[model samples]
Target: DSEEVNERVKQLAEKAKEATDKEEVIEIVKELAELAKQSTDSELVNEIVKQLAEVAKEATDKELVIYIVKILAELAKQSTDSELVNEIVKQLAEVAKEATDKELVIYIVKILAELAKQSTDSELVNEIVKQLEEVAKEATDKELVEHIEKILEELKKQS
Candidate 1:
């Protein structure tokens, strides 16, 4: 049934490889994403998602990585699987811990608290609080520390 789709995908791949312009390559990827959405095979589509995630994780740009974590916040909210949800929490926690910018740390902590409310596991949520506390310890700015305290207190009420 997907023989035509397969052929079309192959043609797009070839075109992408030979494309002279960055815009042309992006256009091919857009078409490929459309095809992936229409595909019946969930496994292949999931692999594509994982590949996209890997690429995002490999990004060295701090702003881009922060943007990627914001996208992850959306995914965490929509996710039904607790394991994957908590995994995202842990991943975001690592990002929070490594971040030097107080603004970024505050952003990550706010998302962590949001994710904590969605989570059913107490230990994981505690981990979220623990990570936040660690960030709070290093926080010298009054506003940033106050914001973390607010988020931590909110999380306390939820648990």
Candidate 2:
């Protein structure tokens, strides 16, 4: 039974790799992600996540990557492990950087700000602030920079 389940997972992983149809890949990824979340085996879950990330990287579909990132972030939020959260943050940052989309960057910055609000650690807040500042600097749009500055000011006031 164990081997059967692993074989199925492997099959799904391979299918996920060969999938070229965006919609079909999205559906498969969603199903696999849900199964991974429900699995009791930590190794299996990790493997699923790794495979999903690989699939996402090769997909080259912006919408699909956004969907995957959102799902991963929500899963990270539900996890009790701080290390998992850190890893999620790291992956999210990488994806955001790769996207280089101003709207997506803004969305991620807002998400990070909300996460920072829930954190009591000053170091985490500082790190978030630094990340926001870097992204703001990289953004060439004047309006976006002004928005970021306003957000930074509000965050500073709160601290």
Candidate 3:
């Protein structure tokens, strides 16, 4: 039964990626991404991310675009792929600039902190710190900036 459910979800995700209706695709992909986050099965998460990325690449709505980027950021956090993490962060930064959502920017900063925690490379840590600082400068919310500052402090300790 579980296998059947998984297969069905996989099929839906694939179909969702190819759907011409943006709203339908966003709904399906959002549900699939949430399921990926909850599922302990690595294969399932991997499949979901792959499908989400495909849909995200085709998404036109700015809000949905940032939402999908956030999913990829989470996926990158789970994986040990530094290059993928870097790429996701860069993409997120670009989308975030366009989206201009304070909460989303804060989330991206948190994701960067997580990435810095896993990275052994000083250069990567330094790069993340620089990006975090830039984000902090742009943030209007004092509380969010403070949270980002804490993350930067932790990264500084690592450095």
1 versus 3: better lDDT goes to: 3
Question: Candidate 3, residues 89-156: lDDT per residue as tens digits?
Answer: 66655545444566666666777788888888777787778877887787677997899889887877
Off by over 4 Å in 1: 1-58
Estimate, for each residue in 1-159, the C-alpha lDDT of model 1 and write its tens digit: 556666666677667556566566556656665565555565444433343344334544455556556666765676565655666677777767766666677788889877777777888788888888987897677887888899888877877
Indicate the residue-level lDDT of 127 in model 3: 78
For model 3 the TM-score comes to 0.62
Give me the runs in candidate 2 sitting further than 4 Å from their true place: 1-8
lDDT of 2 by residue, 25-75 (tens): 888888878986787776676667777777756667778877787777666
The deviation in Å at residue 32 for candidate 1 is 11
Clashes of 1: 0
Q: List the residue pairs that clash in candidate 1.
A: none
Candidate-wise lDDT, in order: 0.66, 0.72, 0.72
